[PDB]
């Protein structure tokens, strides 16, 4: 899979914007940053989460 | 040796907030388990 | 029936759940619940706002180093 | 412990406090029991119904 990025749609807002749980969700990227074609929002709290989880399964020893 | 610090201390790096954004987006993409170690490296 | 719906429940004063926004007449929130926690607030009928996950995040971190060694 | 997000059942231990101070049942298992059932009635996305129900089932068995 090469992630061919998802495009940018815009008439009548079709972009969407609603917080998910925004871990362990796997909408094969298709994130926006603020402070299919579904897409949440990415804050920096489920940065911390999912690295945390990344990093706990990543070294099982 | 903790990890909780060094995002903040990125973030005190970084400075601009765009350029943070869009390292948000390149550690997610990675995050995501699709790149593999040279693209996370480089 | 036919109008006295609305006092057969009056006297038990709580049979239903399904819609009670008043709170005992029952016959931009997701983005003002979404700043505190995460979707556990949902389903319902700054430099301050960062600490309260801090502590959380120090302690999950605490709690993961001590059971992996 | 758990492999993934630690703080979630700590989360999920809000989501049941101020889930059984605000309306007291309307009628302390069967409180998670009626949380499934009611999940299609709302216009909420699958993955979402899919969260919620796994999220119960950790707590059922």
């Given at each position: ?24 969700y ?36 | ?12 790096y ?9 390292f ?12 593999d ?6 | ?69 | ?57 950790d707590?059922?068995?």
């Open positions: 899979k090469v992630w061919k990025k998802q495009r940018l749609i815009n008439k009548k807002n079709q972009l969407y914007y609603e917080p998910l749980q925004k871990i362990g796997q909408n094969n990227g298709n994130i926006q940053i603020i402070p299919d074609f579904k897409i949440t929002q990415i804050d920096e709290n489920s940065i911390k989460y999912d690295f945390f989880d990344k990093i706990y399964k990543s070294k099982m020893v | 040796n903790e990890e909780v610090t060094f995002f903040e201390k990125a973030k005190r970084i400075g601009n907030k765009h350029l943070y954004t869009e948000l987006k390149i550690l997610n993409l990675y995050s995501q388990d699709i790149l170690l040279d693209d996370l490296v480089e | 029936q036919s109008g006295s719906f609305l006092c057969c429940d009056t006297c038990p004063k709580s049979f239903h759940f399904l819609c009670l926004d008043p709170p005992i007449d029952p016959n931009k929130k997701i983005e003002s619940n979404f700043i505190k926690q995460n979707n556990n607030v949902k389903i319902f009928a700054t430099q301050i706002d960062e600490n309260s996950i801090k502590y959380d995040f120090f302690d999950k971190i605490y709690k993961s180093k001590m059971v992996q060694k | 412990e758990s492999p993934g997000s630690q703080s979630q059942l700590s989360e999920y231990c809000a989501g049941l406090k101020l889930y059984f101070d605000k309306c007291l049942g309307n009628m302390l298992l069967r409180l998670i029991s009626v949380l499934p059932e009611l999940i299609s009635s709302t216009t909420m996305d699958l993955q979402s119904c899919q969260l919620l129900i796994k999220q119960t089932e707590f059922l068995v």
